[PDB]
Amino acid sequence: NKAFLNELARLVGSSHLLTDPAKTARYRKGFRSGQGDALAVVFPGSLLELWRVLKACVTADKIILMQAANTGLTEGSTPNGNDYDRDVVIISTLRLDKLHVLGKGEQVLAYPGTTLYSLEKALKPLGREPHSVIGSSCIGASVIGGICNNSGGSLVQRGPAYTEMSLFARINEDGKLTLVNHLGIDLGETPEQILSKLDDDRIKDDDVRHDGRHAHDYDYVHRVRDIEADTPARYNADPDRLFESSGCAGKLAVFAVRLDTFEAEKNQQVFYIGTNQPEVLTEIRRHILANFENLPVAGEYMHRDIYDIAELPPRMKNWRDKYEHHLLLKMAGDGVGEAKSWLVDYFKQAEGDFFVCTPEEGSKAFLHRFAAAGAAIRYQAVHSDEVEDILALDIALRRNDTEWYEHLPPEIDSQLVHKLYYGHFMCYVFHQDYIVKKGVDVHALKEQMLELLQQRGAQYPAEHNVGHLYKAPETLQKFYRENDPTNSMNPGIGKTSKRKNW
């Protein structure tokens, strides 16, 4: 072991290797939960260094945990406990932060540390927008980390993060580390050639091939509008979005992804909708999905309790006081006039009301909605020895569900101090965080709640992935194994075996 570590320090430099528990704690603890021991955290500075570190880990038979930023919410980006059969090496990819724009910006090559934030910035002067907008973009979520988790932001027209074109390393059945270039870009024959070409930014449009594979989720547009389908719009175990790097959850080492970007959206307007009747929001969604020509850009839901705890903008304060259910509907281009006209008519009849945001209201509303997650976490710490731990569920309802707002069995409802509800309303993806009464068996509660969701036909992790909080369905387990036959990369994800060879 003294030798393996010296090799790492030789490959990335001693200032880019951490072994002291007190120093690695920063990378061993999950954003909301999850924690474990790790032998080392290494920070390669080039893709070629990443390759050599992976090779050194495979030859020392270590477990590899790829990490970018670590905003994963279900403990799947940090070690889970200490019972691994081999030492764990966390490879932080955050220094690999270059970005390569292809052509006029219609596609990009993102590297392991490229942040969504930097992607947004580089595309803006090109008149393009990224494929994803998630609550964690403001705190540095990475592009590749979202592809690995099939992340789903607030962007209603884009689907969960997805691409069939990527460059990644895979430990095969024989335990051999292999580099697989499925980027559809000619980069060379050896790892040195391929990775240097990319590290030196010597890729030009001439190296690029155009072949029909998809660099985003095609037709989510269609799937999201099908309000008569009896399955959800998107969920982590959805087999059609599990492709190589897409949904890999750390089971491969993703070096690069080729992704589609989109034309920037014209003139956006946020419509702040509030109501006390769940059915009024249900019909806004159903009518827009079935009848609008223009899909919204975003449609974020916030219940009042989560509103208060997340908590200023006076009109929002007014809406909070008047309405329990809020829908932040962002339209763009023509959808603005379409939404404004239909809402004016709809609310002359339907119970609540709405207003057209001022740039300041609109940004503060979204900033408030995001942060919902951090909220519950902080309410917990405040009331630590008085409430159990936070029970957080991530769910995707059947597209034709007529009752999205849950009415739990009275005996389950009574065990909750608070019920925090927020989500991506148009996609029927909801995050439900509960503050549970002191003395309640949280594990038993969760099990009861998961049974009710199965009964409702919902799927669960929707966007956050299974991590170590959810059991991976058969589709996922089979995918994880195909990618990592030796089970040497982020091992027990989805409550699966943590041991070598599974």
Ligand SMILES: Cc1cc2nc3c(=O)[nH]c(=O)nc-3n(C[C@H](O)[C@H](O)[C@H](O)COP(=O)(O)OP(=O)(O)OC[C@H]3O[C@@H](n4cnc5c(N)ncnc54)[C@H](O)[C@@H]3O)c2cc1C
């Ligand atoms: C406040 C807040 C709001 C959020 N809002 C949303 C939201 O709206 N929608 C949503 O879907 N999620 C949301 N999330 C979760 C977030 O999307 C994920 O935490 C984020 O996408 C993960 O990106 P990351 O850079 O943090 O990756 P990390 O957490 O580091 O996690 C990466 C996951 O991918 C693996 N991985 C990372 N890099 C690589 C690589 N190069 N090769 C192979 N495997 C790799 C890791 O092992 C792990 O399984 C939120 C989290 C927070 C804290």
